[PDB]
């Protein structure tokens, strides 16, 4: 069996970033920041890596893409740029 991988259209999952999704992106980024990964947003003077990730998410300058999984094996690709942050 081949493909699989729903295109950038036909996507039918909640356009809102789930609390589970958001809780990892903020964690994965903050980890990278503390691991000496390049920071995109201008730091106002913050040193805490988790706080930088929260400023990175607010301006949507995070270069990450979530691969949401469906039970059949196929997936949808959503960028944090596309995703709406309510909560």
């Amino acid at each position: 069996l081949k493909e699989k991988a729903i295109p950038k259209d036909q996507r039918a999952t909640t356009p809102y970033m789930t609390k589970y999704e958001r809780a990892r992106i903020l964690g994965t980024r903050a980890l990278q920041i503390s691991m000496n990964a390049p920071v995109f947003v201008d730091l106002e003077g913050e040193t805490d890596p988790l706080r930088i990730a929260m400023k990175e998410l607010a301006e949507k300058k995070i270069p990450l893409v979530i691969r949401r999984y469906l039970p059949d094996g196929s997936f949808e690709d959503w960028s944090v740029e596309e995703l709406i942050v309510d909560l």
């Binding site: 589970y20 990892r24 994965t28 300058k61 990450l64 893409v65 691969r67 949401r68 999984y69």
Partner: protein, 112 residues
């Protein structure tokens, strides 16, 4: 209707002791007990007989007895459950691990 009778009875156990519980929780349990056609019991004889992962089933009483008859019937564990990755020490498809997080090189260039 048999499911509905079970739920109505389960409710009358908890609700009789001055405690309120939401529909979904009892409704899920009542479904898991009925979905498979008969009445899949919450027992060693019940649900633990189903087609569920071999390594997952073993984490309940029988342990070895399953592991013996799993190798005999040459059962392949899919490792899509909780216990499977828990034993293997990997991140299980659970909430935070229900997906993969990736980096886009093209988008990163835009942010500079």
């Amino acid at each position: 209707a048999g499911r509905a009778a079970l739920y109505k009875e389960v409710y009358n156990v908890i609700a009789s002791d001055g405690s309120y519980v939401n529909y979904r929780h009892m409704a899920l349990l009542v479904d898991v007990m009925t979905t498979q056609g008969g009445l899949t019991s919450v027992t060693r004889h019940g649900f633990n007989r189903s087609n569920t992962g071999a390594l997952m089933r073993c984490s309940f009483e029988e342990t070895v007895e399953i592991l013996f008859e799993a190798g005999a019937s040459a059962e392949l564990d899919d490792c899509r459950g909780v216990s499977e990755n828990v034993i293997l020490g990997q991140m299980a498809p659970i909430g935070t691990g229900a997906f993969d997080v990736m980096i886009d090189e093209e988008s990163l260039v835009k942010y500079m």
